[PDB]
Amino acid sequence: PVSPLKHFVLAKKAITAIFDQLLEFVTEGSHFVEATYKNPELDRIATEDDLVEMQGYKDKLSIIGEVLSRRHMKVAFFGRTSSGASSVINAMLWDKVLPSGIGHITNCFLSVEGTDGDKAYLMTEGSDEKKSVKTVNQLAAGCLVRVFWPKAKCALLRDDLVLVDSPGTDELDSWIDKFCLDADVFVLVANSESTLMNTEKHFFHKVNERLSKPNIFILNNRWDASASEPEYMEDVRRQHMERCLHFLVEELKVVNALEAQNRIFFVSAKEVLSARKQKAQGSGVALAEGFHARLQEFQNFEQIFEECISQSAVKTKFEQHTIRAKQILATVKNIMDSVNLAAEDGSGLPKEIDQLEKIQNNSKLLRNKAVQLENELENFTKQFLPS
Numbered sequence: 001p002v003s004p005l006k007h008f009v010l011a012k013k014a015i016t017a018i019f020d021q022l023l024e025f026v027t028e029g030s031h032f033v034e035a036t037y038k039n040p041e042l043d044r045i046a047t048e049d050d051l052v053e054m055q056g057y058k059d060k061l062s063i064i065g066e067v068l069s070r071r072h073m074k075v076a077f078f079g080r081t082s083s084g085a086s087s088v089i090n091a092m093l094w095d096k097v098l099p100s101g102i103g104h105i106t107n108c109f110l111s112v113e114g115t116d117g118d119k120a121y122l123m124t125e126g127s128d129e130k131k132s133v134k135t136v137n138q139l140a141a142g143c144l145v146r147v148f149w150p151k152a153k154c155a156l157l158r159d160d161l162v163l164v165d166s167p168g169t170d171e172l173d174s175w176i177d178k179f180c181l182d183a184d185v186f187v188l189v190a191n192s193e194s195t196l197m198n199t200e201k202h203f204f205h206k207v208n209e210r211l212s213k214p215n216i217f218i219l220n221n222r223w224d225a226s227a228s229e230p231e232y233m234e235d236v237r238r239q240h241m242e243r244c245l246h247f248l249v250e251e252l253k254v255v256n257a258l259e260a261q262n263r264i265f266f267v268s269a270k271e272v273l274s275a276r277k278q279k280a281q282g283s284g285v286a287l288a289e290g291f292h293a294r295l296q297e298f299q300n301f302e303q304i305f306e307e308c309i310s311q312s313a314v315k316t317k318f319e320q321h322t323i324r325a326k327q328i329l330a331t332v333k334n335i336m337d338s339v340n341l342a343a344e345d346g347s348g349l350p351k352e353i354d355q356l357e358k359i360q361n362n363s364k365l366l367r368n369k370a371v372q373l374e375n376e377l378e379n380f381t382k383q384f385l386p387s
């Protein structure tokens with residue numbers, strides 16, 4: 001019963017804590033080497049290069065924890081106008097957050113992120129005032145209007161997801177990149193009353209140029225309009241499936257035809273939205289029906305989406321920082337070894353002996369500490385990054 005998204009938020013809390021401990025350690029470590037380097041009583045027990053390295057790791061690590069804290073999952077929706085992109089987003093949020101017409105109405109992107117506040121509001125580029133919501137939106141060289149919405153009202157925003165609507169793929173496809181390469185999942189919202197178009201196809205090819213292997217979903221929306229016809233429904237679906245498959249598996253072969261079953265859904269976002277928005281009254285009603293089978297299909301989509309995006313986003317957003325921290329800790333271990341050795345070797349003795357043995361001792365506590373943080377990084381990769 002617990003959202004797969006929890007995985008990412010859990011990971012973010014873990015990696016955050018580690019890089020705090022880690023920055024704390026390298027700072028302490030850096031003061032030491034500096035102390036030892038600058039000591040006049042000492043002859044090269046620690047070098048200036050030793051110091052500079054440490055100071056560099058300190059100034060680095062400091063900046064990594066900053067960017068970690070600002071990291072979220074991002075899903076991006078595309079579709080011809082009136083395919084139902086905005087409805088899908090609203091259905092996932094359980095409320096009419098985005099109004100029908102956007103971003104055809106506005107001709108720009110609309111992100112939806114959570115706020116810790118309790119009032120919704122808008123924010124544009126190069127400005128930090130909080131315009132009142134959509135109220136002032138039909139108004140608001142690319143273009144982005146960020147919608148904030150109370151975390152207390154949507155689970156997905158509470159759990160670090162950001163949702164983006166495009167203006168519909170009803171030109172161009174180079175200026176969007178300004179919004180996209182952050183994205184962990186791209187969703188093609190298709191109109192099931194009509195067929196997969198090339199203008200739709202064409203935009204995902206450019207994503208599949210640039211991004212290495214992007215996670216792509218296809219939602220065949222408006223599925224209600226082909227309903228109530230059990231034998232018609234099933235032969236129609238087969239034809240949409242086969243063209244949807246042919247676009248994922250072969251023309252963008254970014255998935256094989258068995259993993260692709262878990263990438264393609266038939267869905268009625270309007271049905272799901274109405275059903276969800278009604279939870280203030282305790283059930284009436286839907287459009288054709290059919291309607292329980294559709295609503296389950298949307299829920300299976302949600303669950304798979306959330307498995308996919310959480311796991312993908314942890315890899316591409318946390319793994320390399322972890323690798324970088326392993327290499328950092330290894331170089332620091334080396335530097336303690338180097339100081340410790342230089343110190344039993346006298347150089348790189350009355351009571352000088354006793355200053356040196358204290359230096360040896362500090363370096364070993366530091367090295368031992370590098371080793372705990374190493375252990376915490378492996379424990380991290382074990383829980384959040386296997387295999």
Ligand SMILES: Nc1nc2c(ncn2[C@@H]2O[C@H](COP(=O)(O)OP(=O)(O)O)[C@@H](O)[C@H]2O)c(=O)[nH]1
Nearest residue numbers: 081082083084085086087100221222268269270
């Ligand atoms: N019958 C039906 N209508 C839908 C569905 N999804 C959206 N709509 C309707 O289609 C129109 C436009 O949908 P919208 O989400 O605003 O399209 P967008 O421009 O891609 O954002 C509105 O009348 C919606 O209520 C659906 O699954 N079934």
